[PDB]
Design a protein around this nucleic acid. Sequence first.
RNA 1: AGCCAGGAUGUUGGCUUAGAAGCAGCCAUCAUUUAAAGAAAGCGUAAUAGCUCACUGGUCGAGUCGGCCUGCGCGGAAGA
Lengths: 38, 176, 136, 141, 94, 69
Amino acid sequence: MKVRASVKKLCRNCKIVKRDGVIRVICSAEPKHKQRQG
Amino acid sequence: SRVAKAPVVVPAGVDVKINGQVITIKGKNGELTRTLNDAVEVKHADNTLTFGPRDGYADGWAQAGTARALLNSMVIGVTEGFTKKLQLVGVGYRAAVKGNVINLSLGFSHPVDHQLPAGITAECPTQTEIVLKGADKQVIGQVAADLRAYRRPEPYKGKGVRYADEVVRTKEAKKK
Amino acid sequence: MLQPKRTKFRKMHKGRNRGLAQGTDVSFGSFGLKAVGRGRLTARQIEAARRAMTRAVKRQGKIWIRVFPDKPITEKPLAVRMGKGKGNVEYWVALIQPGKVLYEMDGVPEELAREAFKLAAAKLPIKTTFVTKTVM
Amino acid sequence: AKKVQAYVKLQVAAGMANPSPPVGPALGQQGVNIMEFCKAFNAKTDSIEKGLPIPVVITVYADRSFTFVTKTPPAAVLLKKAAGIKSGSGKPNKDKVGKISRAQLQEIAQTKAADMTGADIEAMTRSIEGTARSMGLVVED
Amino acid sequence: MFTINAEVRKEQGKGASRRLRAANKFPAIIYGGKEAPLAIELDHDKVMNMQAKAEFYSEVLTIVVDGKEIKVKAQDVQRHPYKPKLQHIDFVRA
Amino acid sequence: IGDLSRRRGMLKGQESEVTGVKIHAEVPLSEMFGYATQLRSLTKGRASYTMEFLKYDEAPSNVAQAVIE
RNA sequence: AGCCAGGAUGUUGGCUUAGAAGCAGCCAUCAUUUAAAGAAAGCGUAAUAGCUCACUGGUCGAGUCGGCCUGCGCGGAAGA
């Protein structure tokens, strides 16, 4: 998890979804790519 | 909304009591109930089941698709049931079934004496394996996840209550 | 950084920054960076913007700078009361108007040209856009 | 003839029947004993001369019997000595050495035909004159 | 080979023109000859979509107005400063 | 072999025997420091090696610039 | 877009061949056919094999992909 005010799709499998109103990016392959708050 | 239009087939031996918005399924493996959303319409058929985004709220196409696959999960539940296999990978891990509770030995200094919810049965043919049997995909989905919640797999050798169909994402131990 | 060699005066009045701009067309190369906001650009941001996008192509193509700092913006030193004379000039800015052609370049392919300007724009305090040379 | 579990598609020298550290990683992956395999290799190795590289395909049956359908010089290695030099590349468009004809290569395409039967006699040559194009060589007839 | 739909504008002026461009239409002018000029209004969206071609600036433009269609040439384009729209075109009646 | 790459290991190839996979390589003396402490940390104590001298070969730019005091 | 058959690869292609086998990257960028096939991006890897990706040859059967110009909202947003 990285609380970065900007979020970039850092890979191919990185998907951007809106959980609880907050924009969150998760990845199936790399757990280092998880981030939110963007 | 391809799945919102796609009708749920009701094959033989299955009874569907469409009573207003609460629908009760009934078949080979018992009987389940589920209340639907008011954005969703319902009609039986000659035999199958077709649902619609009932007038009023226009986002029913988003809603009925959820309302479809729930019943499409329910119609298979009372005809075949469902089953999640598990792996209790790790030396010193066993599990037995005493009727409804499961005695999981997970390397803890307290016994994990976990009790299942109702409507499901567990099977442990191998001590490192758990075969849960139940009707709903929902109720056995949580139970398998609650079983994983006691010891989630660590990505070095995968010690945990991992699924038999899931590949664990192990990384390199990479050091001494 | 860019600075006027031998100008006439030491200081200059503040002055409002109104209206629109004159440099509007991509007049030299093919791809330019027109400004959409209205502020000012000091020389340090002028040097930093080119640097980031020069090394984006690392040598490639010609790069023209269309804005030059003329206004000698001063500052007063700390713990000094108001008055007592105009303060010394600290940095030089170029007042930017809407529709002003900033940095312009040529000789580069389009997709990396928009990429190089994207690396440059985040160093700017003005919202800009990527514009392309039209005919006439 | 089993699809992928053990098949290896590489070899270099016929006369050097010993698998040098370049070749050895492929044999050590599945444990191929080359010594008795050399006696089966030398039945067809003697038919061809030394100086022109040879590959092999390796097939291991289920009952530990392991065999092979070895080769003669294929595409790259025959066109090189046809130019006279084995190498001289790293710069295809930046170098220009030699000019070779396809009619003479139409004869050696028939020697590649009994070896590595690459499609359409001239279009296989057109696939390897592209390699002659990529070895820095020029080809014109 | 481009064709332009247009019509004659009336009650011109500064605020009058500003009233036009906030309504997806923009003014112009057609001059050149032994006659009077023609302040012609033409649709903004349509001609902006076709100004990307080089044949918009290298052809006898076929503007039709009140049935009478004329062949003109594009003299200058006074475009908007920073918005990608445009403000005015001069059509010399070639 | 991959960790040997980080120790500048000039490899030769992979060879096999009845129960072992033998690999001989060239390694700098400067990165020999505590090697079997790092060898059996990766091989579960089932491996071994023996160091022999070949030549005072080329020291690259990063290795040449280091020891200059 | 998925699902099965795939990956249409000559070419272990130079090279540096210790291997860089489509994938170290400089390059030719040739060609097979060209109904499904770039002499190639990517982790993975000593290097192949690899799963894929480009791309769907057959399955189903309807609409769909990404930018542009903008109206109104979200996050960015922590004080006694």
